[PDB]
Design a protein around this ligand. Structure first.
Ligand SMILES: Nc1ccn([C@@H]2O[C@H](COP(=O)(O)OP(=O)(O)OP(=O)(O)O)C[C@H]2O)c(=O)n1
Ligand SMILES: [Mg+2]
Ligand SMILES: [Mg+2]
Ligand SMILES: [Zn+2]
Lengths: 8, 325, 94, 1111, 142, 47, 243
DNA sequence: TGCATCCGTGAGTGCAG
DNA sequence: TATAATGGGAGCTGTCACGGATGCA
């Protein structure tokens, strides 16, 4: 959903 | 039109000069508190504790009491509103409130009642009515408490007109988007199909047929085009005829006689013109009390004709219209 | 109201066909200097300037009075468009 | 003249200071006058103690201070600055490891100060911070709208200081918990706090219903710190649940009193609600290693016992005024302050853990600007920072007392239902029920009751006298709506002997319901009728004869009353007209006893008994936000011996110290030949003659001279191609001369600007080659006057740079402002109104010879048509005239208190005493009755106004007592066939004058992308022909007229340019091409990868770009 | 509120403008597919013409909102409401708007097909008899 | 010729390129000194 | 933008950027705010004010509104007489208010002869928020509305304002005079009833003069002979209108 | 298969601003 | 251009009603 927690 | 226009400036001119020399005014002394009032006010309290006792003696409930406390006070309001107008027409028939309301120049019985009699039962914020009515008149003057109680109602109507408007407006825009392409594109689509306007409404009171209200029949019939011959009270109304306002009043009379129950009429529910309607299935250009000119954007007219009233529709109210459209 | 409107609506089959005939004729006159008018100098619409009476400039006032005279023909497919737009620039030049 | 008062109510306390909500609140947030030692942790201070100290190296907070302002209020007003104070804050940095101590006092920027009348100057423009109403911090219970017998519980903190949490008990028996819209079983949480299965029944132990249902040991099979990680899973799908980060999350959501603050109010509310004291404004604690709950179990207690039947577990009326509360200005600005401090700390720790951990100071570890911009922001673009309403001194005072339910932290328009807008039973004596706006904002913006005040917790409360036994004390006490509901409170006007309750029935409310009750049962009494209504509403005489819906317009239109040069206070008043001028801080008074030394159009100096020579100077002809001359005039003469508190100068709309929003005029109430139609008003030319309804107005006209890439802009008197006529009123520099007459077209300031890459084209170079004048390189960019404006140059400000004092936005050399005055007589189109909701537009001005007049030759001033009254039901205006008749012949004014004023006998008595003056004067001056007065009386008798068989004087007497008099049409001398109502009425000029509103355009500016004409008078607009108008033209079948509005008149640039050549040339207008705005539509769909194609009938494209986009 | 039935009818008639298929007979249509009642009655002629089976259909009652969004003209429908849903679906089908109704021509800015703009009246000519007779005489002989 | 319909349909990438006059290579607007458009950017006039 | 996930805001505010679909759609979208209706040239606004002297087909247009709204036409006529040498100098006369000479107004009066303007009032609920009028010039700012048309517009004079629109082509002029002129639009298109019709003062004036007194003095006596009835009334015992 | 349940889309006009 | 440094940070709250597409006993 949240494209930063994804990459994190 | 030309003459009615001149006729109209004419009524404009004289009606205006007369209005001023006539001597019409408003002084506090024109709000005639009829004296029948305190009879009815006294007559109420006794019957009020006439019910505060069939409960004081635990004879029946609060849901029972309230139910009947407020039927008392509403038919009381009726009484004094009457005595206001009886007292006017019998004694001071040239009083300015009476004149103004009676002609249709302003005012109506329920406002005028609140100048002269009592204000009445007021609303509580919820939607329930106060069992205490404000008995003060506007001539007499309200108690601060009466003034406050009376405040909820007005605000709850202020909010009403403000939200509601949004819906009337929105509703109108839908109506235009769904009818706009509808124009009067040809003279006759040759359809052999029609609709039968009833002059009778099948009751459940007698659950027999009773005649329908005149204005309602005028609105199903005025300016239509008969799709079949009709012969009533020796008159012959022919296929193709645009029912004039008199053709209408006639058929109501033929129906009061028993010669007719429903009139076959060329409706646009049955026009077969593509993308529009034809002349016959439409009828008059009501704006001109004559058959409609090919080219009239009827669909847009329709929409403006249905939307413009709702502002202005107080509940169901306008909701029910929307739930239907 | 417009002088003699109820009879205008009587000539046409639909009120909007009057409007188009009027507005068309109205402009035949504006470009041509009225010379094609089918009025006589007493029927001429006249306005009143501060100096004195003068021919009405409003080509529509004209067109409508003209229509009442009967001295005009209305209908569809009566001429080639370009045979008119010069036979008239011939009979009454710009 | 003499002033008769009516009314039997002895009002114990006065109206309180009517700006207190604005002044008390701010000063209580600054404390700029409290010795720092003695300050108190609320407001500006409290924010400091919240954000500090900054944590790993540790930076701590000592104290703050405030300096006086760089410039005084007026100075900032003129120079478009802000009236602010410097904010210094003394800080000590200490090193987490060594003992480092540095200590500086670092400048944080300027805080904007509040003037005496309780407003603000922000970029040199007075503004007001409207209090905000919102639900109040606390815990509430409310029935579930789905399942009739189950109830949600809600936990609400101050806005943006915590999350909302709901406790709906699901249809599976065990209780739920919502946070950031995530549901999960409650027990998991109670575990984390250290809870044991038994200490639950040990505390609930009643409701085997669900006390026993809430328990589910799939969860109990864990220690506290176990479920603690159990839950972090439930709110962070993806974050690794390390026990240093899961404690960090919940703590930072439920116990960290640094982003979770229940109100200070919220503590007390849920405190007394749940019957438990509270350590801090915080749900949970972190004490001795783990979590120690404070609120969740108490809340849990209530909810359950409600869902069975328990006593004292009521739902809550969330619209009650014990559960709604007010964010006054001080609070609202501190919130923004707690947000600058918050950002500033994000940036210190950033430079704490990078840059040098030992050679650092408070000075360079703080960048103030994040604070600066948060303040600047709240004051320059908030929805609660409003351009001040200083139309007249009341409009400014009413503003400061306004209440918005809207705004950041409140409701969006769409959020607003009914219940927020309804009048609440508890508004009684707190929020006026009349003064609200008609339209969308109805019931969101409201006004502060006149006697009401907001307490330290932010609740409105209202005073009531205590009645004990049956006798009424003078001890007044202010109650929140909650304690109010405890008592039986009798009405303001219950009749007394001395201080005992005479009546045997008393008219009282319990919990706002109206009850009839004996004086033994009565505990308190209203203070005054004035305590239920707005300030404006309280200015309305005979309010109790006016329907509510037009008392409301009467209230609001006041604030729109234009200050009149001959303004006068109403001949009928309510007894507040004086205070209002007082607190309006616009009139000018005497500080102590003394004597008047000098007096002058410009200043007033007074020698005091204290030997001081105080010199008050006079704000003479100041322009207000709305253009309405704010002018102070002196009301004492040299030597006048003045006690303390007496008047020295009249403000605007003040006449010897009474609020003068309009003028008293002789009013006749009758149709008048059409010019009365549908609320239009007819007036006597005599009103312009004696300069009634005339008002001074000023418009500022600014211009800037700026540095360009093509040259500088010059403010000159040297403007090419312009005739000495066109310059005769300009000084050598290019400024109009103070004291001139400027009208449309006139240059006020010459300005020159350099010509671009259109330096003359061939067509133009050649044309000048003929005229022996070669291309000039500068341009006339002067500032002219716009259409429909003009006046008398009153003043000019010239700010250059290179001069002292001054420095302007980058790239501007000099700016010039020129203020222009206009005297405005009343005129056909201006709008008039009276305090009863009667409003109309002056439709005709007759010469005095046509005005109706009375037999003794006097002509009426105003003719108001009676058709206005009946349907509007605002009878009070009728009384206002009758008693105004009397006062016009006895030379009297009256004070009729609202709801406690002059009744009908009391005024009919006055109306007789006036009759003798009006007529007896006559029968002695050699004139008897008149022949037309008998013809009228003949008629009046048929009507039934007069008693048949009675002397003319007897009968005229009878009509006079009715407010009615004989009236002669001045066009004929013949009487009005009837007797009319003539009297004296207070009637104001409203801000809505035709001069501000007549506008028209042939052609003008256009819009960048759409090429359609701009909007608004100031842009030289065009008129929006919207969807509904298009429909109109559509319904008529006006095809060509519609097409015109859609092409030639808006954005068919070809045929538009093509037409305005055809008109000027006398040729019919060209048939139109495609609107340039449809093209914009095509290209905007292309830019979405959508291929829109115009096609001829044989289906092959049509280039509506005439090849300009083909290749 | 006196208000002539004919107005409501016109609207209602649009509410009933569409129909649902129930057996495609011998056509490319599909059970459940919705379309204008005109367009199925239209080709059910083309099918009684080539003698094949006719489409079984069924009356559909839509409300006003849906009935406008379902109109043929994607320019009317897009400018109404639900612009992207309207616009995507029309682009996919390469919908070509015939410009039959009013909004369609309002956005293009052409003469609307009503009133003075109605094909029934817009083509009318007006000539004075002293120019109609003028031009009919030369054109009698070649 | 005379517009009589309005077609709307999908843009093939080739077609999008069929429209284009320029690939906007740089995210530059206009030169911070010349105030003229930087080339290969959103206002480049060669495109 | 905004459609999926977070919306792209610029730094230092929370304001979604305006995506191409945002441009296209909504009440402020391109369709509803620029295609189905634009702003327009040759149009003005002002306060309305009742003119009872007006004839049904007329209105009161401030001459200053008139000058601008017809500025092209005035410029030409100003030449076709000679109040200026050419059109461009004619325009510079009317640009500063001092330079306007009296025969400009006689020149305008010439201009608007016969042609009508359009009046619009606030909510155009139906076809008759717009009607057409021959304008007669007037000093002063306010527009003059005819009392008969106030109902259709729902106009009173608590401060209402109205919009003015000059048709331009001979076709638009012919449309307004024939189809949209007030006097031709007397019946409602919704009910077919009349819509221009007496209202507040006008009926009050006629009711008064057409009511009849009913007096109570005589109270219905029985007299056999007129001869004596009069006498009784001359006695003062029986009021003139008693039945 | 029938029915919760979520996601997305609407929510009057013009003028002042 | 070179100590060593290795998974973010702020949610936002009091509308509503309908229509369609999806999940679930
Ligand atoms: N949000 C609003 C507010 C007002 N108006 C216009 O202004 C009119 C409101 O005036 P009212 O006084 O409320 O209505 P009247 O019909 O004039 O009342 P009355 O019978 O007492 O004259 C309605 C409407 O034409 C509007 O369209 N939209
Ligand atoms: Mg109005
Ligand atoms: Mg009204
Ligand atoms: Zn048909």
């Amino acid at each position: 959903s949240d494209p930063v927690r994804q990459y994190l | 039109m030309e003459k009615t226009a001149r006729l109209l400036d004419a009524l404009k001119y004289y009606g205006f000069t007369f209005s001023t020399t006539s001597g019409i005014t408003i002084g506090i002394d024109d709000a005639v508190i009829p004296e029948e009032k305190k009879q009815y006010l006294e007559e109420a309290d006794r019957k009020l504790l006439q019910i505060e006792q069939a409960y004081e003696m635990g004879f029946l409930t609060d849901r029972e009491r309230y139910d009947q406390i407020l039927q008392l006070w509403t038919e009381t309001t009726e009484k004094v509103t009457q005595a206001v107008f009886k007292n006017f027409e019998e004694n001071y028939p040239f009083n300015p409130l009476y004149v103004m309301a009676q002609s249709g120049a302003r005012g109506n019985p329920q406002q005028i009642r609140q100048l002269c009699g009592l204000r009445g039962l007021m609303q509580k914020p919820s939607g329930e009515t106060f069992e205490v009515p404000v008995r003060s008149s506007f001539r007499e003057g309200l108690t601060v408490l009466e003034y406050f109680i009376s405040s909820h109602g007005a605000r709850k109507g202020g909010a009403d007109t403000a939200l509601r408007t949004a819906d009337s407006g929105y509703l109108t825009r839908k109506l235009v988007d769904v009818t706009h392409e509808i124009v009067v594109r040809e003279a006759d689509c040759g359809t052999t199909n029609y609709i039968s306007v009833p002059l009778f409404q099948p009751d459940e009171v007698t659950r027999s047929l009773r005649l329908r209200k005149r204005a309602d029949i005028e609105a199903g019939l005025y300016g239509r085009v008969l799709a079949r011959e009709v012969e009533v009270l020796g008159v012959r109304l022919e296929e193709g005829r645009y029912l004039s306002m008199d053709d209408v009043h006639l058929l109501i009379k033929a129906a009061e006689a028993g010669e007719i129950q429903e009139v076959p009429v060329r409706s646009p529910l049955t026009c077969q013109t593509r993308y529009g309607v034809c002349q016959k299935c439409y009828g008059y250009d009501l704006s001109m009390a004559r058959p409609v000119s090919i080219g009239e954007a009827v669909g847009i007219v329709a929409a403006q004709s249905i939307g413009e009233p709702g502002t202005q529709l107080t509940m169901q109210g306008l909701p029910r219209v929307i739930e239907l459209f | 109201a417009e002088p003699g409107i109820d009879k205008l609506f009587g000539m046409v089959d639909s009120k909007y066909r009057l409007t188009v005939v009027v507005a068309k004729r109205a402009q035949q006159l504006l470009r041509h200097g009225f010379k094609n008018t089918v009025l006589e100098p007493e029927e001429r619409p006249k306005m009143q300037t501060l100096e004195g009476l003068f021919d009405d400039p409003n080509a529509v006032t004209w067109a409508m009075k003209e229509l009442l005279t009967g001295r005009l023909v209305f209908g569809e497919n009566l001429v080639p468009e370009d045979r008119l737009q010069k036979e008239m620039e011939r009979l009454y030049p710009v | 003249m003499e002033i008769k008062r009516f009314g039997r109510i002895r009002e114990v306390i006065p109206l309180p200071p009517l700006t207190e909500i604005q002044v008390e609140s701010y000063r209580r947030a600054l404390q700029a006058d409290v010795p720092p030692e003695k300050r108190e942790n609320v407001g500006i201070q409290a924010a400091f103690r919240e954000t500090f100290p900054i944590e790993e190296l540790v930076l701590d907070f000592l104290e703050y201070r405030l300096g006086e302002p760089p410039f005084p209020q007026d100075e900032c007003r003129e120079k478009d600055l802000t009236y602010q104070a410097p904010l210094y804050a003394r800080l000590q940095l200490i090193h987490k490891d060594t003992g480092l101590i540095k200590e500086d006092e670092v400048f944080l920027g300027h805080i904007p100060l509040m003037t005496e009348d309780g407003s603000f100057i922000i970029n040199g423009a007075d503004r007001v911070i409207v209090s905000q109403i919102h639900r109040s911090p606390g815990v509430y219970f409310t029935p579930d709208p789905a399942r009739p017998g189950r109830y949600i519980a809600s936990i609400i903190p101050l806005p943006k200081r915590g999350p909302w949490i709901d406790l709906e008990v699901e249809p599976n028996g065990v209780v739920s918990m919502k946070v950031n819209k995530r549901k999960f079983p409650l027990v998991l949480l109670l575990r984390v706090l250290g809870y044991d299965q038994e200490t639950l029944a040990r505390e609930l132990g009643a409701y085997g219903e669900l006390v026993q249902g809430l328990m589910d040991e799939s969860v109990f099979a864990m220690r506290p710190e176990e479920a603690l990680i159990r839950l972090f899973t439930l709110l962070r799908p993806g974050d690794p649940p390390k026990r240093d980060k899961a404690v960090a999350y919940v703590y930072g959501l439920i116990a960290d009193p640094r982003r979770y603050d229940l109100g200070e109010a919220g503590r007390y509310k849920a405190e007394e609600k749940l019957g438990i004291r509270l350590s801090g404004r915080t749900l949970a604690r972190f004490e001795d290693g783990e979590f120690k709950d404070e609120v969740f179990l108490p809340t849990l207690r209530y909810l359950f016992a409600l869902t069975a039947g328990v006593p004292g577990h009521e739902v809550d009326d969330i619209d009650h005024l014990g559960n709604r509360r007010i964010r006054t200005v001080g609070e609202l600005m501190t919130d923004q302050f707690r947000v600058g401090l918050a950002r500033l700390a994000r940036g210190v720790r950033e430079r704490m853990l990078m840059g040098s951990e030992d050679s650092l100071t408070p000075a360079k570890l703080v960048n103030s600007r994040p604070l600066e911009a948060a303040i600047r922001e709240f004051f320059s673009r908030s929805q609660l920072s409003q351009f001040k309403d200083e139309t007249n001194p009341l409009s400014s005072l009413r503003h400061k007392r306004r209440i918005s339910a809207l705004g950041p932290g409140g409701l969006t328009r769409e959020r607003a239902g009914f219940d927020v807008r309804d009048v609440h039973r508890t508004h009684y004596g707190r929020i006026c029920p009349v003064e609200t706006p008609e339209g969308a904002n109805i019931g969101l913006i409201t006004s502060l009751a006149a006697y009401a005040r907001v307490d330290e917790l932010g609740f409105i409360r209202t005073p009531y006298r205590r009645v004990v036994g049956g006798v009424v004390t003078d001890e007044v006490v202010y109650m929140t709506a909650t304690e109010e509901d405890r008592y039986t409170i009798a009405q303001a006007n219950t009749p007394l002997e001395g201080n005992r309750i005479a009546a045997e029935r008393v008219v009282a409310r319990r919990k706002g319901e109206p009850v009839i009750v004996s004086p033994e049962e009565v505990e308190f009494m209203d203070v005054s009728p004035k305590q239920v209504f707005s300030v404006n509403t309280n200015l309305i005489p005979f309010l109790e004869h006016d329907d509510a819906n037009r008392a409301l317009m009467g209230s609001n239109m006041q604030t729109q009353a234009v200050p009149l040069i001959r303004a006068q206070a109403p001949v009928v008043m309510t007894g507040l007209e004086e205070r209002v001028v007082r607190d309006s801080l616009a009139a000018l008074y005497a500080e102590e006893d003394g004597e008047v030394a000098k007096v002058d159009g410009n200043r007033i100096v007074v020698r005091y008994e204290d030997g001081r020579l105080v010199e008050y100077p006079l704000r003479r002809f100041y322009r207000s936000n709305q253009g309405t001359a704010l002018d102070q005039r002196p009301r004492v003469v040299v030597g006048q011996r003045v006690r303390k508190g007496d008047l020295l100068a009249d403000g605007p709309a003040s006449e010897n110290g009474f609020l003068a929003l309009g003028q008293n005029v002789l009013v006749a109430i009758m149709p008048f030949d059409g010019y009365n139609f549908e609320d239009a008003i007819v007036i006597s030319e005599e009103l312009l003659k004696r300069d009634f309804y005339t008002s001074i107005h000023i418009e500022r006209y600014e211009i800037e001279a700026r540095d360009t890439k093509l040259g500088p802009e010059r403010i000159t008197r040297d403007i090419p191609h312009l005739s000495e006529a066109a310059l005769r009123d300009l000084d050598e520099e290019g400024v109009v001369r103070i004291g001139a007459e400027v009208k449309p077209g006139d240059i006020l300031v010459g300005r020159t600007s350099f010509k671009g890459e259109s330096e003359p084209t061939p067509e133009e170079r050649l044309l000048r080659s003929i005229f022996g004048e070669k291309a000039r390189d500068v341009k006339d960019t002067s500032l002219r006057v716009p259409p429909g404006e003009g006046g008398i140059v009153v003043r000019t400000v010239r700010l250059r740079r290179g001069d002292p004092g001054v420095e302007l936005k980058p790239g501007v050399r000099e700016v010039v402002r020129v203020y222009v005055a206009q005297k405005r007589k009343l005129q056909v189109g201006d709008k008039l109104a009276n305090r009863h909701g009667n409003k109309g537009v002056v439709a005709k001005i007759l010469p005095v010879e046509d005005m109706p007049h009375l037999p003794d030759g006097t002509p009426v001033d105003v003719i108001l048509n009676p058709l206005g009254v009946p349907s509007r039901m605002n009878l009070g205006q009728i009384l206002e005239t009758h008693l105004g008749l009397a006062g016009y012949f006895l030379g009297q004014r009256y004070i009729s208190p609202i709801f406690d004023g002059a009744k009908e006998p009391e005024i009919k008595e006055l109306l007789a005493q006036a009759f003798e003056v009006y007529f007896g004067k006559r029968k002695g001056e050699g004139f008897g009755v008149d022949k037309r007065e008998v013809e009228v009386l003949r008629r009046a008798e048929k009507l039934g106004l007069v008693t048949p068989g009675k002397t003319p004087e007897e009968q005229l007497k009878e009509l006079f007592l009715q407010g009615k008099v004989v009236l002669y049409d001045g066009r004929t001398g013949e009487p009005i066939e009837g007797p009319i109502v003539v009297g004296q009425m207070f009637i104001m000029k409203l801000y809505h004058m035709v001069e501000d509103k007549m506008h028209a355009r042939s052609t003008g500016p256009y819009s960048l992308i759409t090429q359609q004409p701009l909007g608004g008078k100031a842009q030289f607009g065009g008129q929006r022909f919207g969807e509904m108008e298009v429909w109109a033209l559509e319904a008529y079948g006006a095809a060509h007229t519609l097409q015109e509005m859609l092409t030639l008149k808006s954005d068919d640039i070809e045929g538009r340019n093509a037409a305005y050549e055809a008109i000027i040339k006398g040729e019919d207008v060209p048939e139109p091409s495609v609107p340039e705005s449809f093209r914009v539509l095509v290209k905007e769909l292309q830019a979405l990868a959508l291929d829109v194609q115009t096609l001829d009938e044989k289906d092959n494209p049509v280039d509506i770009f005439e090849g300009l986009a083909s290749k | 509120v006196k208000l002539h039935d004919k107005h409501i009818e016109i609207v209602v008639r649009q509410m009933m403008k569409y129909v649902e298929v129930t057996d495609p007979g011998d056509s490319r249509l599909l059970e459940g597919q919705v379309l204008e009642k005109w367009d199925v009655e239209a080709l059910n002629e083309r099918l009684i013409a080539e003698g094949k089976t006719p489409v079984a259909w069924k009356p559909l009652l839509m409300g006003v909102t849906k009935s406008a969004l379902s109109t043929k003209s994607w320019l009317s429908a897009a400018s109404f409401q639900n612009t992207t849903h309207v616009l995507t679906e029309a682009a996919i089908a390469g919908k070509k708007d015939e410009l039959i109704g009013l909004k369609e021509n309002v956005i293009l800015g052409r003469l609307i097909p009503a009133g003075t703009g109605s094909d029934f009246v817009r083509f009318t000519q007006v000539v004075d008899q002293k120019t109609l007779k003028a031009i009919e005489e030369a054109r009698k002989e070649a | 010729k005379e517009v009589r319909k309005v077609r709307i349909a999908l843009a093939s990438p080739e077609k999008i390129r069929s429209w284009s006059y320029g690939e906007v290579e740089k995210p530059e607007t206009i030169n911070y000194r010349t105030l003229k458009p930087e080339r290969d950017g959103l206002f480049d006039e060669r495109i | 933008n905004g459609r999926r996930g977070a919306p792209v805001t610029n730094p230092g505010s929370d304001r979604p950027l305006r995506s191409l679909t945002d441009i296209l759609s909504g009440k402020q979208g391109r369709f509803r705010q620029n295609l189905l209706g634009k702003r327009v040239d040759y149009s003005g606004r002002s306060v309305i004010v009742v003119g009872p002297q007006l004839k049904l087909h007329q209105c009161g247009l401030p001459k200053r509104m008139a000058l601008e709204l017809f500025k092209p036409f005035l410029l030409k006529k100003m030449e076709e007489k000679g109040i200026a040498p050419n059109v461009k100098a004619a325009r510079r006369m009317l640009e500063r208010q001092r330079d306007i000479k009296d025969e400009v107004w006689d020149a305008l009066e010439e201009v608007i002869h016969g042609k009508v303007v359009l009046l619009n009032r606030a909510p155009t609920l139906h076809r008759l928020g717009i009607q057409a009028f021959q304008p007669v010039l007037v000093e002063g700012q306010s527009i003059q509305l005819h009392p008969l048309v106030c109902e259709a517009f729902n106009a009173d004079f608590d401060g209402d304002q109205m919009a003015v629109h000059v048709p331009l082509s001979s076709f638009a002029q012919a449309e307004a005079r024939i189809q949209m002129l007030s006097a031709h639009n007397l019946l409602s298109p919704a009910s077919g009833e009349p819509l221009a019709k007496p209202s507040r003062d006008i009926i009050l004036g006629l009711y008064y003069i057409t009511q009849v007194r009913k007096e109570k003095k005589g109270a219905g006596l029985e007299f056999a002979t007129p001869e004596e009835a009069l006498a009784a009334h001359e006695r003062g015992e029986v009021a003139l209108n008693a039945p």
